[PDB]
From a paper:
GH18B crystallized in space group P41212 and its structure was determined by molecular replacement using the structure of human AMCase as a template. To study the substrate-binding mode, the structures of two complexes of GH18B were crystallized and obtained: that of wild-type GH18B complexed with (GlcNAc)3 and that of the GH18B-E647L mutant with a bound (GlcNAc)5. These structures were resolved to resolutions of between 2.2 and 2.8 Å, and all data-collection and structure-refinement statistics are summarized in Table 3. Secondly, the structures of GH18A and GH18B are very similar, with an r.m.s.d. of 0.88 Å for 344 Cα atoms. Although the overall structures of GH18A and GH18B are similar to that of OfChtI-CAD, with r.m.s.d.s of 1.3 Å (for 367 Cα atoms) and 1.5 Å (for 360 Cα atoms), respectively, there are obvious differences between the two enzymes. Firstly, GH18A and GH18B from OfChtIII do not have the same surface hydrophobic planes as found in the GH18 domain of OfChtI (characterized by Phe159, Phe194, Trp241 and Tyr290). Secondly, both GH18 domains have shorter and shallower substrate-binding clefts than OfChtI-CAD. As calculated by the CASTp software with default parameters, the volumes of the substrate-binding clefts of OfChtI-CAD, GH18A and GH18B were estimated to be 1628, 1399 and 1100 Å3, respectively.
Here, we report an arthropod-conserved insect [name] belonging to group III from the pest [name] (OfChtIII), which contains two GH18 domains that act without synergism according to enzymatic assays and structural investigations. OfChtIII contains 987 amino-acid residues and is composed of four domains: a predicted TM domain (residues 7–29), two catalytic domains, GH18A (residues 94–461) and GH18B (residues 530–889), and a CBM14 domain (residues 922–976). The two GH18 domains of OfChtIII possess similar structures and substrate specificities, which differentiate them from the chitinolytic [name] OfChtI-CAD. The degradation activity of GH18A and GH18B (or GH18B-CBM14) in combination towards EGC was equal to the activity calculated from the sum of the individual activities, suggesting that there was no synergistic effect between them.
Numbering used by the authors: 528 to 902
């Protein structure tokens, strides 16, 4: 029973031509859960972010009609949303409780299977306690509802950071682990266009020559840090990105990890953000002339460069390798960011959804079992 939780970004519907992604585009057999991001808070209540969203919620749910075991969740928060609304949400019990009772009604009305909470990020003791009370109250009310109610309990999940420093600052790990059904660790964005050296978005292992700090910026170390802090392995869903992060090189002849960079790489035609590329945009980049693909055998991920453009990403081989690591460590499953950025049209020349397919096939047969795993 390894789980596969796939994020669906609302704004993917706004991309041009082939990029355009709609709930209909979702293969309902790929993922065990689809998490729709993001709803918002208005007057401290769970509400639809845009008036056009309600029809989208309807479309995402009802994927179910095509796979009745598929769970559909709604996410609130995200990076843009910030910390202040969550702080104000949890500032008093009545607001908090009323948010809780209405969220349940909101969710039951749309027939969602549960709520994903993405506070980015709690920081400091007051936030730490507030995040715990919020999760504690959602969880208990979800249960209480299932009993005073008819059906199966609403699911509760949260996206959490990979940075070991963010973990200490924001997360009472053992406490949140009691209330969450799934802990979705964001094991990506380790490097990017905010830095002035080239580095990979989501390296599995570090370079042997890495500084003790750079060694921590990896999928492997992050996931292990979550375990070390008390997260139950069966609830830990390790984040898998279907995008890459790109750089403009200072010097075309310097293209190795650590090479000087002036900023992000040229935007992809569909995601329109320098420094960022969806997987189908990567494939386009790779078929340009003279683009050299490299396999980093220490980090265990690919990257590619052509003239002053450099991109670090995940492909079939790196994701499969990650699944092998995953099973060996014994984690409960994966989280995918995001389903709309995998090559859902099969324009890379392999199949449709080649990234998620590759992970799914490599996960076939895996059963998660807890056992003593040393310190």
């Amino acid at each position: 029973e390894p789980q596969v939780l796939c994020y669906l970004t609302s704004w993917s519907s706004k991309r041009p031509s082939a990029g355009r992604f709609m709930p209909e585009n979702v293969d309902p057999t790929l993922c065990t859960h689809v998490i729709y991001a993001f709803a918002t808070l208005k007057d401290h209540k769970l509400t639809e972010a845009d008036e056009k969203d309600a029809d989208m919620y309807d479309k995402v749910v009802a994927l179910r009609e095509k796979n009745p075991n598929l769970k559909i969740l709604l996410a609130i928060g995200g990076w843009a949303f910030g910390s202040t609304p969550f702080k104000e949400l949890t500032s008093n019990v009545f607001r908090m409780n009323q948010f809780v009772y209405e969220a349940i009604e909101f969710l039951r009305d749309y027939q969602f299977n549960g709520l994903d909470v993405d506070w980015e990020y709690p920081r400091g003791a007051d936030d730490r306690a507030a995040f715990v009370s919020l999760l504690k109250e959602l969880r208990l009310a979800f249960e209480g509802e299932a009993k005073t109610s008819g059906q199966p309990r609403l699911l509760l999940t949260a996206a959490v950071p990979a940075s070991f420093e963010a973990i200490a600052a924001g997360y009472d790990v053992p406490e949140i682990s009691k209330y969450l059904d799934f802990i979705n660790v964001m094991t990506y964005d380790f490097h990017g266009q905010w830095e002035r050296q080239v580095g990979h978005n989501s390296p599995l292992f570090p370079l042997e020559s890495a500084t003790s700090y750079q060694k921590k910026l990896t999928v492997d170390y992050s996931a292990r840090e979550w375990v070390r802090q008390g997260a139950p392995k069966e609830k830990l869903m390790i984040g898998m990105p279907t995008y890459g992060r790109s750089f403009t090189l200072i010097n075309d002849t310097q293209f190795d990890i650590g090479a000087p960079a002036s900023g992000g790489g040229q935007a992809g035609r569909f995601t329109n953000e320098a420094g960022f590329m969806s997987y189908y945009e990567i494939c386009e980049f790779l078929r340009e002339d003279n683009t050299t693909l490299v396999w980093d055998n220490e980090q265990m991920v690919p990257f590619a460069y052509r003239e002053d453009q450099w991109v670090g990403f995940d492909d079939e081989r790196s994701l499969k390798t990650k699944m092998a690591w995953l099973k060996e460590e014994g984690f409960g499953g994966i989280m995918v960011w995001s389903v709309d950025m995998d090559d859902f049209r099969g324009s890379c020349g392999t199949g449709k959804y080649p990234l998620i397919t590759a992970m799914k096939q490599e996960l076939s047969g895996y059963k998660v079992k807890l056992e003593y795993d040393g310190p």
